Paper text:
Survival of motor neuron (SMN) functions in diverse biological pathways via recognition of symmetric dimethylarginine (Rme2s) on proteins by its Tudor domain, and deficiency of SMN leads to spinal muscular atrophy. Here we report a potent and selective antagonist with a 4-iminopyridine scaffold targeting the Tudor domain of SMN. In order to understand the structural basis of compound 1 recognition by these reader proteins, we determined the crystal structures of compound 1 in complex with SMN, TDRD3 and UHRF1, respectively. In this study, we identified some low micromolar antagonists with a 4-iminopyridine scaffold targeting the Tudor domain of SMN, and compound 1 shows >4-fold selectivity over other tested methyllysine or methylarginine binding domains.
To explore if we could identify more potent compounds than compound 1, we procured commercially available analogs of compound 1 that include single, double and triple ring molecules and measured their binding affinities to SMN or UHRF1, respectively. SMN bound to all the four triple-ring compounds with affinities between 2.6 and 31 μM. The four triple-ring compounds have a 4-iminopyridine scaffold in common, and none of them is more potent than the original hit. However, the positive binding results of 1-substituted pyridine cores to SMN presented here could confirm that N132 does interact with the imino group and substituents on the pyridine nitrogen would point away from the Tudor domain, as larger 1-substituents would otherwise clash inside the aromatic cage. Indeed, our crystal structure of SMN in complex with compound 4 also confirms that the imino group of compound 4 forms a hydrogen bond with N132. In addition to triple-ring compounds 1 to 4, SMN also bound to two of twelve double-ring compounds, compounds 5 and 6. Both compounds retain the imino group, which pinpoints the importance of the imino group-mediated hydrogen bond in the compound binding and is consistent with our crystal structures of SMN in complex with compounds 1, 4, and 6.
Author numbering: 84 to 147
């Protein structure tokens, strides 16, 4: 699931996310989602590093 049925984000979606150390937003792909926790792991494009994010903190994709 019911949590997933009411969730906008899905594995593989493009989003943007805050890279907290530099205070700036960057493109990412959602690699994993825990729908109970409402957390995910994103893969930042180009760099390829992974980070946990709250689903609540994901942003609309950067225009491309
Ligand atoms: N692995 C990253 C690294 C940086 N950043 C920040 C950064 C700063 C300037 C820029 F043009 C692109 C990324 C980011 C990631 C992933 C998401 C954003 C800065 C150094 C490594
Ligand atoms: Mg719940
Ligand atoms: Mg669980």
């Amino acid at each position: 699931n019911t949590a997933a049925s009411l969730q906008q984000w899905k594995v593989g979606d493009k989003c943007s996310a805050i890279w907290s150390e530099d205070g700036c937003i960057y493109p990412a792909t959602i690699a994993s989602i825990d729908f109970k926790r409402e957390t995910c792991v994103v893969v930042y494009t180009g760099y390829g590093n992974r980070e946990e994010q709250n689903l609540s903190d994901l942003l609309s994709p950067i225009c491309e």
